Amino acid sequence: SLPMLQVALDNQTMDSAYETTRLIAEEVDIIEVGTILCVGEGVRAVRDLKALYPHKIVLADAAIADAGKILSRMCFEANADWVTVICCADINTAKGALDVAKEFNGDVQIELTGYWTWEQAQQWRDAGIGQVVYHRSRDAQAAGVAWGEADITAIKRLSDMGFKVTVTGGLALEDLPLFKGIPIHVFIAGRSIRDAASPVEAARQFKRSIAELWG
Amino acid sequence: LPMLQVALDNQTMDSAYETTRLIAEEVDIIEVGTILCVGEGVRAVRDLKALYPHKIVLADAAIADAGKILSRMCFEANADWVTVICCADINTAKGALDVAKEFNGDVQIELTGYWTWEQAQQWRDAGIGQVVYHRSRDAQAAGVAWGEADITAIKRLSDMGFKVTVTGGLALEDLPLFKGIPIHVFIAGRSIRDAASPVEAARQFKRSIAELW
Ligand SMILES: O=P(O)(O)OC[C@H](O)[C@@H](O)C(O)NO
Ligand SMILES: O=P(O)(O)OC[C@H](O)[C@@H](O)C(O)NO
Ligand SMILES: [Mg+2]
Ligand SMILES: [Mg+2]
């Protein structure tokens, strides 16, 4: 299947977010309420975005660290389809969020970061987690960290374990061929779409490139 | 003496105010819980600091990435302190700290779930002076108790030079487990907010801390 495209709305206010969505809502598959938007506006951002775009998958990038059932329920009651749980959360946090996700016919992704282990990845699978987000951190990127070999190896191994893998972190169009040949579920682009001279054409470029590389 | 912090793990400001109108003057630190950060957003920090400008306000944002951006949003809303989750990239913690210094604030690393001693030394090397030793709410709900391994870890963190906050379903009766350790802050959320008498609950915590330290 072609990798899907997710836009990250890492905006501090809803109106800033809408400057993007009014252009590209129908140019992407998934609309993410970025952590920065969740923190800027609260869970109303999920409710309002889903109300505008009820046919789209809406992902709340809550990066849940604890209180899995409470935070997940807040997001799902606001009509989220998918929610994120940070990988260092206690395993009961992920399990809790998943339990609530199932109630709402939604799903949970584990957001990968820090010194996570392959034993922990197996724990997520045994818990029934089917999605992981492989993130090059914005702050690592800013400190000069590049996408490379070790990332491809890890992503392939996560996929082989049965996860649908999302890839993100300052992706540019030129980065996509690094991942060719791997059944990536979703690529997220935030800055590379929102900050482009033409967000519509940036999103279209990503779609064209994906269609060529995975066609 | 260890300070007393109340956690406002509420979904709306009006629910938080049900607690702060009783106990704001009975604690040292008012926490905007992660639940409140997600429920209302950074307006919660702004509003609570305006109400209680003489109290330390902690935004329990549990920052996982975009350290400079998220911490600036909290500090522009007049936070004193902000949390960064322990598995954040080291550059996220450094970024949040750099911004905190612009505002004469501080960053705490939230030790909830998995982390390593090597990471602890990294935080120290980066200039981080505060950690929050948590028993995860979800771990507690799964029957995990406070135990000697926690005490040993807290002492170790203190010995590395961190000011240590202790939290996670703390009851009054738990305080003596930590006796002898120079704890910076004890946090209570449920044990204060959900008490038949929140005022009595907060004062009992302060009374006990004063006895033990
Ligand atoms: O493409 P970016 O601007 O890096 O945004 C996507 C990224 O996944 C962010 O939403 C994020 O969650 N960073 O932690
Ligand atoms: O005393 P509690 O109800 O456990 O609340 C304090 C705790 O520190 C929470 O604010 C929290 O951050 N749990 O992850
Ligand atoms: Mg995101
Ligand atoms: Mg908290």
UniProtKB/Swiss-Prot annotation, chain A:
Record's cofactor remark: Binds 1 Mg(2+) ion per subunit.
Chemical reaction(s) catalysed: 3-dehydro-L-gulonate 6-phosphate + H(+) = L-xylulose 5-phosphate + CO2
Stimuli inducing this protein: Induced by L-ascorbate. Repressed by UlaR.
GO BP, one annotated term: 'de novo' pyrimidine nucleobase biosynthetic process
Binding site for substrate: D10, R191
Pathway(s) annotated for this protein in UniProt: Cofactor degradation; L-ascorbate degradation; D-xylulose 5-phosphate from L-ascorbate: step 2/4
Positions contributing to Mg(2+) binding: E32, D61
E.C. code: 4.1.1.85
Gene Ontology molecular function, alphabetical: 3-dehydro-L-gulonate-6-phosphate decarboxylase activity; magnesium ion binding; orotidine-5'-phosphate decarboxylase activity
Gene3D superfamilies: Aldolase class I (3.20.20.70)
Pfam families: OMPdecase
Family assignment from sequence similarity: Belongs to the HPS/KGPDC family. KGPDC subfamily.
Function per UniProt: Catalyzes the decarboxylation of 3-keto-L-gulonate-6-P into L-xylulose-5-P. Is involved in the anaerobic L-ascorbate utilization.
Further remark: The reaction mechanism proceeds via the formation of a Mg(2+) ion-stabilized 1,2-cis-enediolate intermediate. Water molecules competitively shuttle protons from the side chains of His-135 and Arg-138 to alternate faces of this intermediate. The active site is located at the interface of the component polypeptides.
Subunit structure: Homodimer.
Protein name: 3-keto-L-gulonate-6-phosphate decarboxylase UlaD
Species this chain originates from: Escherichia coli (strain K12)
